[PDB]
């Protein structure tokens, strides 16, 4: 089983005017592509070190594995969290849970925006599901640290706040990026991930 | 392979009165044993995750691997750094390097003691060799984080400043433990590690 770069499910310009084609092309075809390849390189190095019982080599490889492995996990989710058919508000059981756990959909938006804007440096904001508590939970992660691998929460919706995700279009003004991205959220996909947690 | 607890190179009471037999027996047969057992469990989980390509599981296993893997690496070195015939000062090229890089043996002791006393929480102090710079270097490490795996420095002499290493005998007074341990340093072993660094 070798990881592979997934195709983007839509045209590079499908998210205009909210996210321009230049960002989408660079973010997918350059940034994500590097993560998959570097993840595969690290896994092959780790397999060799593991078979030899070289614990020092295993530990030295952990930063590259989390960085590149998280990069592959996060971006693969991110593309599915967006869609030209997205935007608006969710419906059904997910909307009920958002209202129950955050008060309202608008309050949820404020909390996830605050967590995403609040990331100092590189990282991600996540809406997740806490399996043990059986409810939604917002968390932020640094760099490419993935939500489930580092927190156990199941990712539902991720907002990439790496500068490369918005800088070409919005420059330093990250809040302008957060406003635009709500128009392309694929709530159908987020619902599928949420419903997969409930049985 | 499967990691195994190495035999101690001497009796548990060989370091009296500086480190008592109760500490040595607990530290080796309980603390270190747990690291080996848990390290083997974590390595087996990682092998399974690698074959399935489960990157999330790999990343979730990193804390146990570094903690237990570092514990096995670190403690195995610590036992060899001590000897009932130890103490005093080194000789030959190692003493020359200590004088060159730290000024004198006494100044080296002050610096490594300060770094070891300066550890806030659990961790380790290390004298290492920087291969790229070709000289000695003092560093501190948190928890069981190993020197080479996390810094690239080759370990020469390690001082375990975890509370379990000295609390039974010295209680909260870590400086008394740090002073006593110099009497049992196996400079012969540290010298072997140093010469292994040089061609
Ligand atoms: Mn990105
Ligand atoms: Mn210890």
One DSSP character per residue, B83-143 reads: -TT--S---HHHHHHHHHHHSSHHHHHHHHHHHHHT--SSEEEEEEEETTTTEEEEEEEET
For residues B134 and B114, the answer to whether their CB atoms sit within 8 Å is no
Q: How many CB atoms lie within 10 A of CB B48?
A: 13
Closest residue by Cα to residue A194 from A141, A133, A121, A128: A128
Identify the three-state secondary structure at position B159: strand
Q: Which residues in chain A have their CB less than 8 angstroms from residue B46's CB?
A: 46, 50, 58
Question: Are residues B56 and A148, on separate chains, in Cβ contact within 8 Å?
Answer: yes
Residue A180: closest CA among A114, A87, A106: A87
Taking the C-alpha atoms of residue A148 and residue B59, their distance in angstroms, rounded to an integer, is 9
DSSP summary character for residue B199: -
The dihedral built from the CA positions of residue A150, A154, A159 and A164, taken in this order, carries a sign that is positive
* Cα B100 to Cα B133: distance, rounded to the nearest angstrom: 14
Give B-chain residues touching A43 at CB under 8 angstroms: 50
Quick check: B150 and A47 CB within 8 A? no
Facing A3 at nearest CB: one of B53, B59, B62? B53
Tokens for B154?
Answer: 């080759």
> How close does chain A come to B137, measured CA to CA in Å?
19
A145 among annotated binding-site residues: no
DSSP state of A19: S
Ligand 2 centroid–CA B149 distance in Å is 17
Instruction: Round to whole Å and give the CA distance between A35 and A99.
Output: 36
Alpha carbon of B25: minimum distance to chain A alpha carbons (Å): 25
Measured between alpha carbons, how far is A83 from A91 in angstroms, rounded to an integer?
Answer: 16
Q: Which long-range contacts (CB under 8 A, 24 or more apart) does A111-119 make?
A: A111/A138, A112/A138, A112/A157, A112/A159, A113/A175, A113/A178, A115/A139, A115/A140, A116/A140, A116/A159, A116/A161, A116/A174, A116/A178, A117/A161, A117/A174, A117/A175, A117/A178, A119/A161
Upstream peptide bond of A50 is cis (omega within 30 degrees of 0):
no
Cα–Cα distance measured from residue B149 to residue A139, given in angstroms and rounded to the nearest whole number:
29
CA distance B6 to B91: 28
Q: Which of B124, B126, B133 is nearest to B101 (CA)?
A: B133
Task: Give A114-168 as a DSSP string.
Answer: HHHHT--SSEEEEEEEETTTTEEEEEEEETT--HHHHH-PEEEEEEE--GGGTHH
CA B98 to centroid of ligand 2, rounded, Å: 26
Check CB contact under 8 Å for B69 and A50. Answer: no
Distance from CA of A134 to the nearest CA of B (A): 21
Sign of the CA dihedral with B71 first, then B73, B79, and B82 last: negative
The enclosing H or E element of B160 equals: strand B154-160
Q: Which of A39, A47, A73 sits opposite B56 (nearest CB)?
A: A73
Q: Which residues of A96-120 are buried (b: 16+ CB within 10 A; e: fewer)?
A: ebbeebbeeeeebbebbbebbbebe
Method: neutron
* Cα end-to-end span (Å), chain A: 28
Q: Are A150 and B61 in contact (CB under 8 A)?
A: no
Q: How many helices (H) and strands (E) does chain A have?
A: 9, 3
Q: Which residues of chain A approach chain B closer than 8 Å at the C-beta?
A: 1-3, 39, 43, 46-47, 50, 52-53, 55-60, 62, 65-66, 69-70, 72-73, 145-146, 148-150, 152
Burial class (CB in 10 A: 0-12, 13-18, 19+), A2: exposed
Q: Residue B181: phi, psi to the nearest 5?
A: -65, -25
Partners of A59 on chain B (C-beta within 8 Å) are 65-66, 69-70, 146, 149-150
Judged by CB atoms closer than 8 Å, whether chains meet at A56 and B146 is answered as: yes
CA distance A189 to A147: 17
Residue from B186, B188, B181, B185 nearest B162 by CA: B181
Token pair in block for residue B19: 């480190």
CA distance B28 to A60: 25
Ligand nearest to the CA of B35: 2
Alpha-carbon distance of B39 to B62, in angstroms, equals: 11
Tell me the C-alpha distance between B105 and A163, whole Å: 49
CA–centroid distance, B164 to ligand 2, in Å, is 6
A82 conformational bin, left if phi > 0, alpha if psi -120 to 50, beta if neither: beta
Q: In 3D, which of B174, B190, B48 has the Cα closest to residue B123?
A: B174
CA B111 and chain centroid, separation: 17
User: What phi and psi, each to the nearest 5 degrees, are found at residue B136?
Assistant: -75, 160
Ligand 1 center to residue A165 CA distance, Å? 6
Residue A15 main-chain phi, psi, to 5 deg: -100, 5
How far apart CA B165 and CA B31 sit, in angstroms, is 10
Element (H, E) at B156: strand B154-160
User: How distant is the Cα of B68 from the closest Cα of chain A, in angstroms?
Assistant: 10
- DSSP conformation letters of A159-199: EE--GGGTHHHHTT-HHHHHHHHGGGB-HHHHHHHHHHH--
Q: Give resolution, Å, one decimal.
A: 2.3
| Domains in chain B with CATH codes | 21-80 (1.10.287.990), 92-197 (3.55.40.20)
Taking alpha carbons only, the member of B161, B115, B113, B157 closest to residue B136 is B157
C-alpha to C-alpha distances, A40 to A5, A69, A150, nearest whole angstrom: 11, 9, 20
Residue A188 tokens read as: 């159908």
Residue B52 has a CB neighbour count (10 Å cut-off) of 11
For B57-74, b/e burial (b = at least 16 CB within 10 A) is bbbbbbebbbbbbbbbbb
CA nearest to A57 within chain B? B149
* Neighbouring C-beta atoms of residue B150, cutoff 10 Å: 18
CB contact under 8 A, B46 and A50: yes
The 3-state DSSP class for residue B20 equals: coil
Give Cβ neighbours of residue A37 (< 8 Å, ≥ 6 apart).
none
DSSP letter assigned to residue B6: P
């Amino acid at each position: 089983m070798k990881h592979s770069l997934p195709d983007l499910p839509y045209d590079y310009g499908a998210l205009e005017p909210h996210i321009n084609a230049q960002i989408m092309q660079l973010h997918h075809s350059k940034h994500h592509a590097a993560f998959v390849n570097n993840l595969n390189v690290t896994e092959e190095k780790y397999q060799e070190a593991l078979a030899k019982g070289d614990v020092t080599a295993q530990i030295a490889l952990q930063p590259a594995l989390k960085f590149n492995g998280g990069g592959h996990i996060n971006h693969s989710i991110f593309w599915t969290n967006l869609s030209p058919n997205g935007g608006g508000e969710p419906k059904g059981e997910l909307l009920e849970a958002i209202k129950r756990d955050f008060g309202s959909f608008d309050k949820f938006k404020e909390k996830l925006t605050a967590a995403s804007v609040g990331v100092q440096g590189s990282g991600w904001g996540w809406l997740g599901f806490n399996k043990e508590r059986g409810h939604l939970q917002i968390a932020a992660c640094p760099n490419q640290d993935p939500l489930q691998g580092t927190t156990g929460l199941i990712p539902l919706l991720g907002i990439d706040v790496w500068e490369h995700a918005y800088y070409l279009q919005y420059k330093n003004v990250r809040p302008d990026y957060l406003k635009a991205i709500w128009n392309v959220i694929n709530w159908e996909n987020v619902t599928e991930r949420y419903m997969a947690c409930k049985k």
